[PDB]
Amino acid sequence: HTLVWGVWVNGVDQGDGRNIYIRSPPNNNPVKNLTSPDMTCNVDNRVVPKSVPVNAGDTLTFEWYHNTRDDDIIASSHHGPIAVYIAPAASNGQGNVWVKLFEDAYNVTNSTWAVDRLITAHGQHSVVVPHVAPGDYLFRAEIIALHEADSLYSQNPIRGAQFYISCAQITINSSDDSTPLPAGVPFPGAYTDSTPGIQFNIYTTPATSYVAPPPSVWSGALGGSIAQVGDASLE
Ligand SMILES: OC[C@H]1O[C@@H](O[C@H]2[C@H](O)[C@@H](O)[C@H](O[C@H]3[C@H](O)[C@@H](O)[C@H](O[C@H]4[C@H](O)[C@@H](O)[C@H](O)O[C@@H]4CO)O[C@@H]3CO)O[C@@H]2CO)[C@H](O)[C@@H](O)[C@@H]1O
Ligand SMILES: *[C@@H]1O[C@H](CO)[C@@H](O)[C@H](O)[C@H]1NC(C)=O
Ligand SMILES: [Cl-]
Ligand SMILES: [Cl-]
Ligand SMILES: [Cl-]
Ligand SMILES: [Cl-]
Ligand SMILES: [Cl-]
Ligand SMILES: [Cl-]
Ligand SMILES: [Cl-]
Ligand SMILES: [Cl-]
Ligand SMILES: [Cl-]
Ligand SMILES: [Cl-]
Ligand SMILES: [Cl-]
Ligand SMILES: [Cl-]
Ligand SMILES: [Cl-]
Ligand SMILES: [Cl-]
Ligand SMILES: [Cl-]
Ligand SMILES: [Cu+2]
């Protein structure tokens, strides 16, 4: 159970984005149905009134929370990977338009899942804004919680992988457009019951055998990490 509060650009807090530049759902409940339109941008996907201005090479940081800002973020039971996708705003998330910019699943070095790291980072994870065409974008951050992913939703709707999905409206202003954005994948559509990483048992399989759902990270992606960039107590 987790939601995006807002974003930071280059370490500078853009302010509370809920229902403003984030297409926020009414609450922190997971999406589970792989075929639902809810997989795109969660349960209240509509245009919200603002969009965060960035330039290529900027660091764009999502900030998540559980109940209140900078709290425990997400229950530590919710082990799983984190991903960020991008699509042109013109699409409204439809079609084969989602390009992956970041993936983190299990870090063998630290023996930590992405979600575990996210807690330590106070909810913050970032991507470097790529050299795509100027214009309007949706960045879709996705946390997959695996604590009931030993079942499939399609077979048992009380269990299943849980998706915490948040779409931010981002305006890319300055960019040389030297990595024109490719075709991506559809949400719903890319994840199916057979997809690696959707059904997995985190209690018996070793985490080092986890494989995150494809697609793989686009080669034009400029990086990102799960790491606190700013202090919510102070700005
Ligand atoms: O530990 C592994 C074990 O876990 C079992 O599943 C548990 C989860 O571990 C636990 O984290 C989860 O807790 C949920 C709870 O179900 C929700 O009702 C609650 O929703 C809250 C929300 O958190 C608040 O922010 C909001 O204001 O109120 C709503 C209540 O309306 O969210 C918490 C998580 O934060 O519960 C699971 C069981 O239901 C697995 O099933 C088991 O297989 C694993 O082995
Ligand atoms: C999942 O969503 C699909 C497409 O909207 C819908 O037809 C199906 O009823 C859903 N499954 C459940 C259990 O609600
Ligand atoms: Cl739960
Ligand atoms: Cl709010
Ligand atoms: Cl609800
Ligand atoms: Cl659902
Ligand atoms: Cl609205
Ligand atoms: Cl605006
Ligand atoms: Cl708050
Ligand atoms: Cl708390
Ligand atoms: Cl950190
Ligand atoms: Cl349920
Ligand atoms: Cl540039
Ligand atoms: Cl589908
Ligand atoms: Cl992986
Ligand atoms: Cl990858
Ligand atoms: Cl690629
Ligand atoms: Cu939860």
Order of helices and strands: EEHEEEEEEHEEEE
Main β sheet profile: 5 strands, antiparallel
The strand count comes to 12
Report the principal-axis shape. globular
How does this model look, in words?
This protein has 235 residues and is mainly beta. It has one domain: Coagulation Factor XIII, Chain A, domain 1, CATH 2.70.50.70. The chain is 5% helix and 29% strand. It has a five-stranded antiparallel sheet. It has a five-stranded mixed sheet with strand order 3-11-10-5-6. Strand 1 and strand 2 form a beta hairpin. It is globular and about 45 Å long. The two termini are 24 Å apart. Bound molecules: a molecule of 4 linked components (BGC-BGC-BGC-BGC), 2-acetamido-2-deoxy-beta-D-glucopyranose (NAG), chloride ion (15 copies) and copper (II) ion. The site of one chloride ion has 2 residues, from loops. One chloride ion binds next to loops. It is found in: Secreted.
